[PDB]
Design a protein around this ligand. Structure first.
Ligand SMILES: [Mg+2]
Ligand SMILES: [Zn+2]
Ligand SMILES: [Zn+2]
Lengths: 45, 49, 49, 67, 196, 147, 115, 82, 404, 259, 51
RNA sequence: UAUAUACAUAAAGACCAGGC
């Protein structure tokens, strides 16, 4: 459902709503949101 | 156990005392950071003389 | 900060070398807040045993 | 952070002269002789390489979000 | 001189300030003991001037420019300015966009300004080395004409070059940080993160 | 053109306008000022160390050495600077001949240019701008909100 | 947030005429041209070509304001010479100058390379 | 008071000419008949300013003397300062 | 719109304006308008109140418009006058030297909005036609407006003797029949003062014709200044090598006359002035000497400035700076005072740890003998900081009393 | 009442530089030439950037900034390309734009420099300039970081955004030893002499020339590497004559329409 | 005695000498919020139906 | 075919920092 990145071991784990936040293979409680898929288009200006 | 005392950063009782440059980066701390402030509820507080 | 008395605000000869003459806030706080000079070292204290 | 392409005033390219400029300093050139070998005549360009501060080497010490 | 040769090589001598203080060369003197002292600005005043102001000097100061704080130590040539003008820079030196800490990519702080292209100055006080202002400079050098040109720079305004501003000059980043906290308050009342 | 820049000497001021590199007065060598400040700033304010920094730093762009501004020297005079500046082919007081940017013609009076160190300030125009028409209203007074 | 687009300086949108000619009632034989989306590059060439024409008593331009891009050129000529004729001969004389300069710069290049 | 014995300046004080050109322009701005020939005027303040120089405005000004009495001056009887 | 800046001290700080819509983010206003609001452009802000009805909008228009408020009831002077570069440029534009060719007249005339369509005949017809700044500025002056003022440098010996109306230095200003015949303009003519060339306009012509008067001076003399330009540079803060000797020999002479007054008081030979303590008569005699020192070296520095000096250009026309700022740059900064008295004793009987107890000499008590250009010595830097703190404090304290 | 006939003398010609001397011309015509050397000489430079994955320490539009400023070899096909606004096709075609690609990942423990040499173009003609002397540095990568993006380069000129200036500093000087008195020296003896000065070391200034008017306009035109400096000039003249031939047209349509 | 008001705006000031005395630059986004109620007549109804 | 989704909620106070 939702892929998050551990702030310690940097292993993407799939964890879903109404779950405590702990990354497997560390135990570290700080997860990050990865990055969006949709198109970003910048001016070189 | 009577309580818990907030600890100034980079004092002799911080975990960052005596660490070198390489170790301060693995812990994601700035080596240029002077220290001497507190972390209370995440904010960084400075006792003013 | 409210008081209009100008004696506590004025720069005093005893501030040579232990307090920065130029650095100070402005507004109502003029001269009541003072930075420290570079070399100046506040003394931590001891026992007179 | 990292050396600018395109010196601000005139618009000459100092982007590519940084890694060549660190080489000359380690060869015991003086910044006057270094900047003349790189061929930067005007002092608008000579202040890009001379006054530059390279933080991209500090910022690469911290580890990325992803392994 | 033998003290200065040992400090010059201070690296890997394990010989430093404390070994300088322990030799009786330097001394800490607080204020109300400065009433009983005679200071010499520089070793120059110690040499015979043929007209003796004082022959008794009991302490010499290390350098006169250490009387200035951290924010007033960044000003070049501060003795050449009218005195309120070193006080105003003390106020505007704390507001300057620059790289504030080097770990800022990790930190989450509300209101973090940062600037793409900082530069260490070309005319620099010799005490900026101990403020670590070459590592975290806030500012950029700029070529500055002083002229009345089109009239738009009158009063305190500044005209700028727009071709410079297109190349990254003073072009900065403003980070803003939000936080929201799920909680359980009432007995049945829960808050949840969900797309409404 | 709303933002706020200040030097190290206490000269603070907004941006008046932005001319493209075309429209800026250029030297004989094609150097155009990134920033032009009004000369009237100087006389009543009396920041002269702003005039020597533009001077000291034009020798330190040429020589390749980073100049020494430390406050008390007696080893650095305006006169010992200028003699170093005359050796790189500039007028020793730092004045330099400019051409008008729009019309091409020289500018009669010689203009004083040099590299100088400016700071951009936390204060920008986008965060100070505000406009109000029939919006939210306070609860107790039924008057417009604050802030 | 109010910064105008970069292209807004040289591009015309719908309905803007490039040139607008309005007679001037203060003076006989005086005309006032209005050029949209131009600047001192173009305005200064023409003014300085009009003052060579001995039948032109007055010529001058101004940018009314720098943030809006248009030029305003007043021209006053002598009687029986129309200020629209003065401004056309100016433009054809530059074209006959710049076409002579581009040909003389190409000859000096070939001479310069291997010669 | 009587039309005789009126004691007040004959000139129109800059406060009266500010509220006359305002009140007149508010009438014109709502379908009100225009006393003067209007030529290329879609703006009420310019029309009301034009009626004033021609002294066509239909308003009488009631000036209260400080003792409680009053005087009635029509906008034609007064003398326009500017 | 009505347009405001806090605090509103008098009524010229709320004046109705006429909107013109321009890009970017900042309100923009003419520079003459920065005199009433007392606002310089560094981070300032100003409120905007858009009146919502034709009935209240016709009050602003006929009461509070900026062209109506030109003349203040307070001092019965104009509020708004020529300010900053233009008042420096006017003077440089109006000297006898200024001769504008045929190409540079065509541009200036293009910025006159009131110009009646006729190019005036050059002052010098042959060998080459050359207009004068006084000849073009006389097209700016509206109507037929007439004035006699005098320039700031006008010597007092001039009006008395021969050459009253020829005026060798071109100081005396005459305007006859809306035409500038002679003299240089400055703060005393275009500026704000009773009887200035601007104040006669609003009185004789009217508030409408005097609105086009400001906008012509600013546009035709700002677009002229692109030809001359203006600057301050280090060459303009510096004197001759001969003047630097006259500035020292006055100081050594002063600091030597203070040592005699000090030596006379040690032996008691100093007799008190009636009504004055011997400390009061000593603190006066030392101030009488040191003031003459810095008053002499100041006037010795103001003689040395060349006609091309830019400081002298900003001072003479009153645009900015005063004659006392030139003295401190070139010559001497002079005595530094705290609470109206010479620097006190913060330690016991001495001013700083460096000085010897009971030193009343000029150096110990705060006289700074260095100029901002040569740079202040360490202690003179500290005393100069003590005299400036008294300026910052007053400005913070007085405003809250003057507002209550 | 007619145009003057100027002449050109090319003194130095190199790959970075052109010095020419234009004579018998107005000050206003000679200026407007160098004033076109900056703005209106078209060039190719990256504009539309699309960032697929950026793990670098530099945020997205900071890299999209540095890419724009990279010069691209404009030597020829700038004539062929059409402005993207005038181009009829939807989005980008081969006619209005060039496609670039950068796929870079740091596998090694060593710090990898992404250099402009890593921009890969669909067409052999336009490449980064250094590829035609170290390479421009876009960003540095620690192991594990990846930067891949796609960027379409367009045609434009220096009025839009300063990244289309074909030139480095364009020098301009006229009347080097001061006869005309357009600039008035307070002390004439303190000023260094121009490279172009005709005067001996003895005398400071040329004597005043009352009749003269500025001629002999000395240029130095130094390219950025996009366009060879010889063809920065040919494109400025041909590009000023095209703006004056746009006036004579749209003026003629108005005089004929008004009358 | 005084109170917060509607139809007001606040921003930085910068010089434009090209203006008259009584004009002021008002940016487009500060001039887009602030509105002026205008009474429709037969005169301006052509212009206002477009607005 | 007709008809419909119309706006409200983020409290207030305290101290602190800065701006003109
Ligand atoms: Mg201010
Ligand atoms: Zn984990
Ligand atoms: Zn450069």
């Amino acid at each position: 459902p939702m892929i998050y990145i551990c702030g310690e071991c940097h292993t993407e784990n799939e964890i879903k709503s109404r779950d405590p936040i702990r990354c497997r293979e560390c135990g570290y409680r700080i997860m990050y949101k990865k990055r969006t898929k949709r198109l970003v288009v910048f001016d070189a200006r | 156990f009577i309580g818990k005392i907030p600890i100034m950063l980079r004092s002799t009782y911080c975990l960052l005392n005596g660490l070198t440059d390489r170790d301060l980066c693995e812990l994601n701390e700035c080596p240029l950071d002077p220290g001497g402030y507190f972390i209370i509820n995440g904010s960084e507080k400075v006792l003013i003389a | 900060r409210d008081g209009k008395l100008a004696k506590p605000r004025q720069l005093h000869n005893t501030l040579w070398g232990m307090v920065c003459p130029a650095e100070t806030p402005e507004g109502h706080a003029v001269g009541l807040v003072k930075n420290l000079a570079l070399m100046a070292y506040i003394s931590v204290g001891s026992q007179p045993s | 952070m990292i050396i600018p392409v395109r010196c601000f005033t005139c618009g000459k390219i100092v982007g590519n002269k940084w890694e060549a400029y660190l080489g000359l300093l380690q060869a015991e050139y003086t910044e006057g002789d270094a900047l003349d070998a790189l061929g930067l005549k005007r002092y608008c360009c000579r202040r890009m390489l001379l006054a530059h501060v390279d933080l991209i080497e500090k910022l690469l010490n911290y580890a990325p979000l992803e392994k | 001189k033998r003290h200065i040769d040992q400090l010059k090589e201070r690296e890997y001598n394990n010989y430093s300030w404390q070994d300088l203080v322990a030799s009786g060369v330097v001394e800490y003197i607080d204020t109300l003991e400065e009433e009983t002292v005679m200071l010499a600005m520089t070793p120059d005043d110690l040499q015979e001037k043929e007209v003796a102001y004082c022959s008794t000097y009991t302490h010499c100061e290390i350098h006169p420019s250490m009387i200035l704080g951290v924010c007033a130590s960044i000003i070049p040539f501060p003795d050449h300015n009218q005195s309120p003008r070193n006080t105003y820079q003390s106020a505007m030196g704390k507001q300057a966009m620059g790289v504030y800490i080097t770990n800022f990519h990790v930190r989450m702080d509300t209101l973090a300004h940062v600037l793409y292209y900082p530069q260490k100055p070309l005319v620099t006080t010799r005490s900026m080395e101990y403020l670590r202002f070459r590592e975290l400079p806030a500012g950029i050098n700029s070529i500055v004409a002083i002229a009345s040109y089109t009239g738009y720079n009158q009063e305190d305004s500044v005209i700028m070059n727009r071709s410079a501003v297109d190349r990254g000059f003073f072009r900065s980043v403003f980070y803003r940080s939000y936080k929201e906290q799920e909680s359980k308050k009432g007995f049945d009342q829960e808050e949840v993160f969900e797309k409404p | 053109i709303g933002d706020k820049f200040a030097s190290r000497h206490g000269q603070k001021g907004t941006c008046g306008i932005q001319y493209r590199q075309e429209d800026m007065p250029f030297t004989c060598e094609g150097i155009t000022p990134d920033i032009i400040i009004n000369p009237h700033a100087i006389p009543s304010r009396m920041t002269i160390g702003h005039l020597i920094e533009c001077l000291q730093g034009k020798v330190s762009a040429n020589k390749g050495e980073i100049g020494d501004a430390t406050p008390f020297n007696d080893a650095v005079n305006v006169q010992k600077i200028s003699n170093l500046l005359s050796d790189y082919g500039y007028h020793l007081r730092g004045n330099e001949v400019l051409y008008n940017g729009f019309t091409g013609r020289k500018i009669t009076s010689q203009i004083f240019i040099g590299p100088t160190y400016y700071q951009r300030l936390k204060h920008m125009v986008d965060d100070k701008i505000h406009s109000r028409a029939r919006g939210p209203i306070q609860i107790l007074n039924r008057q417009p909100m604050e802030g | 947030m109010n910064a105008p687009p970069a292209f807004e300086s040289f591009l015309l949108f719908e309905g803007e005429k490039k040139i607008t000619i309005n007679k001037d009632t203060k003076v006989p034989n005086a005309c006032l041209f209005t050029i949209n989306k131009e600047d001192h590059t173009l305005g200064n060439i023409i003014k300085s070509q009009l003052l060579k024409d001995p039948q032109v008593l007055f010529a001058g331009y101004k940018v009314p304001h720098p943030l809006e891009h248009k030029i305003i050129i007043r021209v006053q000529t002598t009687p029986d010479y129309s200020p629209q004729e003065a401004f056309t001969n100016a433009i054809t004389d530059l074209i006959s100058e710049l076409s002579l300069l581009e040909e003389r710069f190409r000859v000096a290049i070939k001479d310069k390379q291997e010669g | 008071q009587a039309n005789q014995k009126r004691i007040t300046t004959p000139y129109m004080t800059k406060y009266e000419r500010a509220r006359v050109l305002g009140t007149r322009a508010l009438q014109i701005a709502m379908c009100a008949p225009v006393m003067v020939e209007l030529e290329g005027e879609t703006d009420p303040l310019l029309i009301a300013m034009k009626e004033l120089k021609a002294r066509k405005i239909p308003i009488i000004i009631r000036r209260y003397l400080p003792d409680g009495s009053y005087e009635d001056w029509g906008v034609d009887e007064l003398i326009i300062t500017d | 719109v009505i347009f405001n800046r806090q605090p509103t001290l008098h009524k010229m700080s709320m004046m109705g304006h006429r909107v013109r819509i321009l890009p970017w983010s900042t309100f923009r206003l003419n520079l003459s308008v920065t005199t009433p609001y007392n606002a310089d452009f560094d981070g300032d802000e100003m409120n905007l109140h858009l009146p919502q009805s034709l009935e209240t909008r016709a009050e602003i228009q006929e009461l509070a418009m900026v062209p109506r408020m030109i003349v203040t009831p307070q001092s019965n002077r104009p509020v708004m006058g020529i300010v900053q570069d233009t008042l420096t440029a006017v003077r440089k534009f109006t000297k006898r030297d200024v001769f504008l060719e045929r190409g540079e007249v065509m541009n200036l005339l293009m910025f006159l909005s009131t110009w009646d369509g006729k190019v005036p005949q050059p002052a010098i017809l042959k060998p080459r036609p050359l207009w004068t700044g006084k000849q073009i500025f006389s097209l700016i002056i509206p109507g037929h407006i007439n004035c006699i003022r005098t320039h700031s440098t006008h010597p007092d010996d001039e009006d008395s003797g021969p050459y009253k109306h020829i005026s060798p230095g071109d100081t005396k200003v005459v305007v006859e029949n809306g035409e500038l015949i002679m003299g240089i303009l400055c703060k005393k003519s275009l500026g704000t003062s009773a009887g200035s060339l601007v104040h006669i306009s609003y009185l004789e012509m009217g508030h409408d014709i005097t609105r086009l008067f400001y906008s012509n001076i600013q546009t035709v003399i700002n677009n002229w200044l692109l030809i001359e330009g203006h600057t301050i540079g280090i060459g303009d803060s510096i004197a001759d090598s001969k003047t630097y000797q006259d500035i020292q020999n006055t100081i050594k002479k002063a600091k030597q006359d203070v040592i005699e007054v000090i030596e006379k008081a040690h032996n008691n030979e100093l007799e008190p002035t009636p009504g004055n303590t011997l400390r009061q008569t000593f603190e006066n005699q030392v101030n009488r000497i040191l003031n003459d020192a810095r008053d002499k070296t100041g006037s010795s520095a103001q003689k040395s400035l060349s006609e091309y000096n830019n400081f002298k250009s900003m001072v003479v026309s009153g645009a900015k700076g005063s004659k006392i700022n030139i003295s401190q740059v070139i010559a001497v900064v002079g005595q530094q005072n705290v609470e109206g008295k010479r620097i006190p004793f913060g330690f016991k009987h001495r001013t700083l740890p460096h000085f010897i107890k009971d030193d009343y000499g000029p150096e110990s008590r705060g006289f700074v003998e260095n100029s901002y250009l040569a740079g202040l010595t360490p202690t003179e830097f500290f005393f100069h900081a003590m005299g400036g703190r008294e300026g910052l404090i007053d400005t913070a304290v007085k405003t809250a009393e003057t507002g209550y | 009442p007619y145009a003057n006939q100027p002449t050109v003398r090319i003194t130095e010609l190199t790959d970075e530089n052109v010095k020419f001397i234009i004579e018998n011309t107005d000050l206003a015509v000679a200026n407007s030439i160098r004033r076109v050397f900056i703005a209106e000489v078209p060039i190719i430079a990256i504009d539309w950037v699309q960032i697929d994955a950026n793990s670098s320490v530099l945020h997205d539009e900071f890299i999209a900034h540095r890419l724009g400023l990279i010069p691209l070899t404009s030597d020829d096909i700038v004539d062929k390309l059409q402005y993207s606004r005038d181009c009829t096709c939807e989005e980008f075609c081969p006619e209005c734009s060039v496609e670039f690609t950068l796929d870079v990942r740091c596998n090694e423990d060593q710090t990898r420099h992404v250099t402009s040499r890593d921009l890969i173009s669909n067409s052999p003609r336009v490449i980064p300039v250094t590829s035609r002397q170290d390479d421009i540095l876009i960003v540095k990568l620690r192991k594990g970081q990846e930067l891949r993006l796609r960027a379409y380069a367009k045609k434009g000129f220096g009025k839009e955004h300063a990244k289309w200036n074909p030139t480095a500093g364009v020098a301009f000087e006229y009347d080097p030893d001061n006869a005309l008195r357009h600039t008035v020296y307070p002390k004439p003896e303190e000023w260094p002499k121009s490279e172009y000065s005709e005067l001996d070391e003895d005398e400071s200034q040329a004597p005043y020339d009352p009749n003269g008017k500025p001629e002999r306009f000395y240029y130095n035109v130094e390219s950025c590497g996009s366009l060879r400096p010889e063809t920065i000039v040919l494109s400025a003249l041909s590009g000023l004559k095209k703006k004056l031939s746009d006036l004579q047209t749209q003026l003629s349509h108005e005089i004929q329409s008004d009358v | 005695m005084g109170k917060r008001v509607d139809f007001s705006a606040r921003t930085v000031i910068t010089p434009d000498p090209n203006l008259s005395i009584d004009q002021v630059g008002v940016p487009r986004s500060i001039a887009a919020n602030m509105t002026f109620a205008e009474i429709v007549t037969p005169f301006n109804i052509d212009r206002l139906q477009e607005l």
